[PDB]
Design a protein around this ligand. Structure first.
Ligand SMILES: *C(=O)[C@@H](C)O[C@@H]1[C@@H](NC(C)=O)[C@@H]2OC[C@@H](O2)[C@H]1O[C@@H]1O[C@H](CO)[C@@H](O)[C@H](O)[C@H]1NC(C)=O
Length: 610
């Protein structure tokens, strides 16, 4: 019928369970009933019998919030001494470090000393403060002779690496012999530039060596040139392990290569000649590309490990560095041909270099109504559906995403399809991407808000495919989206950005989250996108980067370029986050170009050189 399950929820949270227990034998086949049962038990969890709690975990263990129940209950079991029941339910894959520490205490008092020592050390060697449960465990562990000075040192190092200096200080204060070097590590980690005083860091011991290494690795981010000099001084003076040298050379090398300093190359080739560190390898090739050394880059692309050599990235650059190295050769044509015909950034680049059409290849998946039944029938789906029908979208979403953690490949797809058909564009993308079914472009590149995005595109003189693409990358059409920093809406405008474009364009001010309304957000984001578009001479490559990383950062990455090819520039963007953002947005815009019947090449003629 029309179940007023809200009475029970209104009574229970917060108050009493009288209407719930009246109704419990009425809402048998209501999908949300177990949320009521969950709260009724949770309010009285501290007096509930093991049996009743175990029964609830057996029969409703698929609920999203079951993890919070298991944590609250396992904590009580341990705090009462009921270790046999604790151990029967302790799951390490809940990733509650509080529980992991209790399990360690279990192990040390039930004859698993080797295992409890291993558990203890695993939780010791982190650079952050652990829960109170772990104090007890570190107590026992220390108590049994295990917390040696090396292990205190190793944790000091992690804590200082993590910038937890209060913890680092307390750990230096617990070193029987190395408290001098320990305070130095905290000092140097706070201000690694003191390493320039080479006479204060002269003592030939592992400890001082380790202090110096941490400092150089830190210094590398801010001032790699300075780090390199001091490395040049200290490498003949202190007894660095070869592991420590390699970790120092890595941070200095990468930080030098990110600012296009060819001093990186020799350093990178000595300390990782086998190409074992993928991040070093990619950045050596990147640097050779930025410096115009095509021969060396081609050579390098031929040695890549099989995981990098197989990416569309290094297949493209092998072909391109070759074509740039030997412009009269016919071998890049056949490498490009293998690669055009894929639907990704580098596939399109390859297509572009052969000047053949991009291959989209839209094929909706092939799911039998058999597999579709399982997922529409699933209790988790039924709950999500009933949650969605009432406005409870956070709950619906929480259901949908928790279901997917166990779903196989075929179901995930069926899941995706179901979400699509409800205008639940973001969940459908999440589902299908998790299935790794990339060829369903109907689902992965939806056309929400089509009339508004195209109107606002044409008023600002922007290609509409570009405004879809920015949108798609920014929020995947989750229209009420809010980021880890406060950017709101479809185009993820910050609140200062929105009021500053409103002013500039005489568009009406938005209440700082009236940005949630599509038609208001798209109007401001389009205007603002046109502002960065015109600020970089209509270049979408540069403007896309600006939108993600700010105009100042992009202007640093453009000096001193002269006649720098767009693909090299994209590839040598220092930040992984924005390299990918740019490649995505460009790629998406191509795809939206075909769906809007407004064809859009991966880059325009005027974008190919800056
Ligand atoms: C999924 O593939 C990831 C990498 O993409 C994110 C994702 N949200 C989170 C929290 O991971 C979701 O998919 C569409 C976007 O929402 C995407 O987030 C956006 O990431 C860019 C940087 O690449 C930020 O400028 C956006 O603010 C961020 N948006 C949100 C709502 O988190």
């Amino acid at each position: 019928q029309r179940r007023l399950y809200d009475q029970a929820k209104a009574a229970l949270a917060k108050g009493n369970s009288a209407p719930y227990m009246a109704s419990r034998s009425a809402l048998r086949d209501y999908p949300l009933e177990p949320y009521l049962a969950y709260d009724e038990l949770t309010h009285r969890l501290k007096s509930a019998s093991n049996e009743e709690v175990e029964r609830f975990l057996t029969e409703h263990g698929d609920l999203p919030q079951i993890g919070w129940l298991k944590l609250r209950w396992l904590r009580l079991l341990a705090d009462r001494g009921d270790w046999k029941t604790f151990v029967n339910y302790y799951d390490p894959k809940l990733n509650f470090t509080e529980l992991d520490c209790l399990y360690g205490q279990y192990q040390l008092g039930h004859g698993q000393k080797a295992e409890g020592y291993a558990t203890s050390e695993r939780l010791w060697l982190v650079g952050k403060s652990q829960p109170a449960a772990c104090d007890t465990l570190f107590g026992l562990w220390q108590g049994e002779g295990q917390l040696t000075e090396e292990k205190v040192w190793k944790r000091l190092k992690l804590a200082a690496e993590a910038r937890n200096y209060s913890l680092a200080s307390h750990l230096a204060q617990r070193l029987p012999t190395l408290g001098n070097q320990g305070a130095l590590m905290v000092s140097v980690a706070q201000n690694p530039a003191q390493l320039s005083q080479t006479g204060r860091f002269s003592q030939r011991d592992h400890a001082t060596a380790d202090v110096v290494g941490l400092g150089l690795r830190r210094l590398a981010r801010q001032d790699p040139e300075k780090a390199l000099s001091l490395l040049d001084y200290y490498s003949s003076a202190l007894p660095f392990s070869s592991d420590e040298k390699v970790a120092i050379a890595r941070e200095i090398g990468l930080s030098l290569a990110k600012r296009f300093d060819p001093r990186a190359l020799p350093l990178m080739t000595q300390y990782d000649p086998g190409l074992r560190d993928n991040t070093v390898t990619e950045w050596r090739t990147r640097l050779l590309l930025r410096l115009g050394r095509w021969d060396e880059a081609y050579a390098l692309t031929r040695k890549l490990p099989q995981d990098l050599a197989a990416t569309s990235r290094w297949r493209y650059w092998q072909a391109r560095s070759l074509q740039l190295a030997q412009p009269n050769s016919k071998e890049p044509i056949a490498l490009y041909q293998k690669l055009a015909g894929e639907r990704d950034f580098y596939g399109f680049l390859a297509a572009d270099r052969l000047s053949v059409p991009y291959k989209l290849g839209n094929r909706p998946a092939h799911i039998d109504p058999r597999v579709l039944q399982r997922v529409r029938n699933a209790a988790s789906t039924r709950r999500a559906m009933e949650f969605f029908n009432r406005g409870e979208v956070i709950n619906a979403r929480r259901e949908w995403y928790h279901a997917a953690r166990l779903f196989d490949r075929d179901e995930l797809i069926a899941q995706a399809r179901l979400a699509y058909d409800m205008q639940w564009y973001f969940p459908a993308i999440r589902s299908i991407s998790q299935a790794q079914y990339w060829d369903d472009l109907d689902i992965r590149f939806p056309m929400a808000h089509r009339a508004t995005l195209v109107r606002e595109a044409k008023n600002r003189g922007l290609h509409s495919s570009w405004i879809f693409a920015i949108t798609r990358q920014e929020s995947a059409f989750m229209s009420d989206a809010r980021s880890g920093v406060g950017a709101t809406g479809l185009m993820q405008l910050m609140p200062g950005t929105a009021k500053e474009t409103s002013r500039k364009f005489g568009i009406p001010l938005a209440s700082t989250q009236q940005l949630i309304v599509p038609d208001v957000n798209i109007r401001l984001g389009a205007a603002y996108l046109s502002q960065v578009h015109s600020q970089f001479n209509g270049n979408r490559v540069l403007a896309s980067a600006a939108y993600n990383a700010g105009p100042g950062r992009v202007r640093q990455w453009l000096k001193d370029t002269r006649h720098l090819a767009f693909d090299v520039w994209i590839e040598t963007i220092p930040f992984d986050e924005t390299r990918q953002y740019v490649q995505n947005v460009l790629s998406y815009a191509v795809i939206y170009g075909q769906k809007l019947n407004a064809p859009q090449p991966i880059v325009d003629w005027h974008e190919r050189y800056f």
